Amino acid sequence: SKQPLLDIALKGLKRTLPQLEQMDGNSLRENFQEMASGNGPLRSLMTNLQNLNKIPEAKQLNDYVTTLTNIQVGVARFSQWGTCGGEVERWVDKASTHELTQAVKKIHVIAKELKNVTAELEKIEAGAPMPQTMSGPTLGLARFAVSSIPINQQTQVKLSDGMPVPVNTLTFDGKPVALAGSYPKNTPDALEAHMKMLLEKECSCLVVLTSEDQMQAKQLPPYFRGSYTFGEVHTNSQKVSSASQGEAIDQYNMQLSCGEKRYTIPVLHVKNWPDHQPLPSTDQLEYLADRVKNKHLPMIHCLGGVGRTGTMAAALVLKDNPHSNLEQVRADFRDSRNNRMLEDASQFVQLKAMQAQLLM
Amino acid sequence: MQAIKCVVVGDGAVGKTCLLISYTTNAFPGEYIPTVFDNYSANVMVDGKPVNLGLWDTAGQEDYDRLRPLSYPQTDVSLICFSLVSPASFENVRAKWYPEVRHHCPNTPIILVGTKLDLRDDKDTIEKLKEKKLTPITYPQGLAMAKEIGAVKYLECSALTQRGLKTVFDEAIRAVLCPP
Ligand SMILES: Nc1nc2c(ncn2[C@@H]2O[C@H](COP(=O)(O)OP(=O)(O)O)[C@@H](O)[C@H]2O)c(=O)[nH]1
Numbered sequence: 001s002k003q004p005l006l007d008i009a010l011k012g013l014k015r016t017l018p019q020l021e022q023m024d025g026n027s028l029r030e031n032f033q034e035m036a037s038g039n040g041p042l043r044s045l046m047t048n049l050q051n052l053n054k055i056p057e058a059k060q061l062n063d064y065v066t067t068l069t070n071i072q073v074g075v076a077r078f079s080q081w082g083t084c085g086g087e088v089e090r091w092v093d094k095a096s097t098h099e100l101t102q103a104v105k106k107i108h109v110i111a112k113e114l115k116n117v118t119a120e121l122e123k124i125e126a127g128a129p130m131p132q133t134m135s136g137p138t139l140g141l142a143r144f145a146v147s148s149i150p151i152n153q154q155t156q157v158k159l160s161d162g163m164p165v166p167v168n169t170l171t172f173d174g175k176p177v178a179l180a181g182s183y184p185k186n187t188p189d190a191l192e193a194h195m196k197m198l199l200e201k202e203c204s205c206l207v208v209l210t211s212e213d214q215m216q217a218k219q220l221p222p223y224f225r226g227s228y229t230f231g232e233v234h235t236n237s238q239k240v241s242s243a244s245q246g247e248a249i250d251q252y253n254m255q256l257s258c259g260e261k262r263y264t265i266p267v268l269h270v271k272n273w274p275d276h277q278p279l280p281s282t283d284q285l286e287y288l289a290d291r292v293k294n295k296h297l298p299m300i301h302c303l304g305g306v307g308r309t310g311t312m313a314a315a316l317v318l319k320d321n322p323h324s325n326l327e328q329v330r331a332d333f334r335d336s337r338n339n340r341m342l343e344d345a346s347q348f349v350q351l352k353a354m355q356a357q358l359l360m
Numbered sequence: 361m362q363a364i365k366c367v368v369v370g371d372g373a374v375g376k377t378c379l380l381i382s383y384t385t386n387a388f389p390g391e392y393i394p395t396v397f398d399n400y401s402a403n404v405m406v407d408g409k410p411v412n413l414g415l416w417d418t419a420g421q422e423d424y425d426r427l428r429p430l431s432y433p434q435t436d437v438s439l440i441c442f443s444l445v446s447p448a449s450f451e452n453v454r455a456k457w458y459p460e461v462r463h464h465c466p467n468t469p470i471i472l473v474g475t476k477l478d479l480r481d482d483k484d485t486i487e488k489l490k491e492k493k494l495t496p497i498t499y500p501q502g503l504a505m506a507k508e509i510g511a512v513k514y515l516e517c518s519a520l521t522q523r524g525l526k527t528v529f530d531e532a533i534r535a536v537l538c539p540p
Pocket residue numbers: 083084085086371372373374375376377378379392393395420475476477478479517518519520521
């Protein structure tokens with residue numbers, strides 16, 4: 001029976017999903033009850049996903065689904081949009097066009113993301129090894145595809161409304177060290193989620209490792225400079241540090257606000273750390289660590305969120321326990337985000353040099 | 361004390377699960393949980409006879425047509441349900457559910473249940489149907505469908521107000537332990 005309900009789910013998503021992708025607010029307000037009852041796409045889709053809750057072997061895939069169906073869409077979890085006569089129906093009836101439209105967009109992106117489940121089911125239709133790993137969701141917000149930059153779903157960061165962002169909490173020898181992620185995607189929604197995380201997590205600070213040159217050739221948004229407003233969040237950051245040339249480090253002061261809430265956070269922008277390379281001197285890495293040092297963890301990112309970012313975090317560990325096994329650190333970090341953490345050899349060399357100097 | 365197996369079927373969303381939970385726990389569901397398949401239990405005394413009642417929840421969607429039948433073996437009595445405020449769920453009683461149940465449960469008793477009694481006289485619900493040129497199913501109509509398919513009884517109820525709930529199951533048991 002596990003194999004047949006697996007096939008009920010595959011054929012069901014293949015045709016239900018493209019339907020949710022074509023939803024429009026007006027056509028929906030007028031037909032929600034039908035879609036959420038009998039053989040309609042919304043109810044039928046939620047039922048098919050329940051199939052995986054009956055198969056203990058699909059544990060990984062089930063945790064993934066559960067996360068998606070618990071995301072808030074109106075004033076309820078997405079899963080409550082599969083039924084009639086309850087909270088969603090009451091809400092939809094009196095929702096304003098503006099409210100209805102934002103809800104419709106969430107359904108579009110969640111529908112699309114749910115095609116990754118279709119893909120796993122098709123693999124099982126051929127060589128059927130029940131996967132024991134599933135990257136967490138990206139909902140159109142990640143800069144890189146998960147096939148190139150995977151995301152550990154157990155340690156992925158989640159906003160208070162259920163929304164997962166492309167960032168992981170790194171840990172070593174049993175304790176968390178910092179929040180690591182890739183350079184934010186140039187999108188209102190991608191940028192809003194980012195800022196939102198900084199204050200909800202109350203990060204001690206924000207560290208940025210990409211040079212001006214790279215932010216150029218790749219066109220990476222300088223959101224930590226002026227002032228902007230994404231969704232319902234606005235940012236005010238002013239440069240506090242020195243003159244012009246020799247931009248070892250530029251320090252800023254950031255004030256964030258989401259509704260009636262505010263939060264202040266210092267920003268450190270490193271400017272002479274080339275991609276795929278170490279810093280100019282061991283002393284510099286050692287000093288940067290003390291600076292950063294001076295819930296409540298630092299948030300760090302380069303471009304991919306795996307190389308330079310890994311190195312920076314490991315240096316924080318060394319400061320407090322200089323005898324720390326760097327081989328163990330790399331292993332624990334990889335188990336916290338993905339297997340590319342600290343993939344550049346030359347940077348691992350600089351770290352061991354910082355260790356040695358420090359014990360001196 | 362004896363045991364009795366009862367199976368519950370009908371179109372998706374007519375309230376099968378809400379009906380079962382209200383009756384066994386005395387509380388309406390706090391949230392919506394899609395049903396693939398499930399089992400519930402209850403201990404009741406009816407007409408002086410102690411009975412342990414076995415209840416089987418099913419999936420009404422049509423892509424489950426080949427899986428649902430695995431629940432029918434050894435059934436003592438079946439409940440075919442349709443929502444008093446959804447005429448299409450009512451038409452499918454004769455076009456699908458009656459034919460499927462009689463085929464797998466050659467000859468055990470069927471009870472026809474009209475659900476969501478509390479919405480039949482509800483203005484907001486009535487005006488909604490009015491648009492699609494529709495109207496609620498009346499008691500006379502339900503009784504008429506019951507005779508057309510051979511059901512031993514026609515009963516209406518509400519999971520939300522709990523009115524008529526106890527009676528459905530007392531009568532389900534009664535039809536099984538019934539004298540000639
Ligand atoms: N007013 C009202 N709503 C009901 C009643 N029963 C179920 N509902 C609603 O209709 C939906 C479908 O019920 P459910 O038990 O999941 O249907 P099933 O698909 O046949 O299991 C629920 O989400 C409830 O909000 C009822 O007796 N009165």
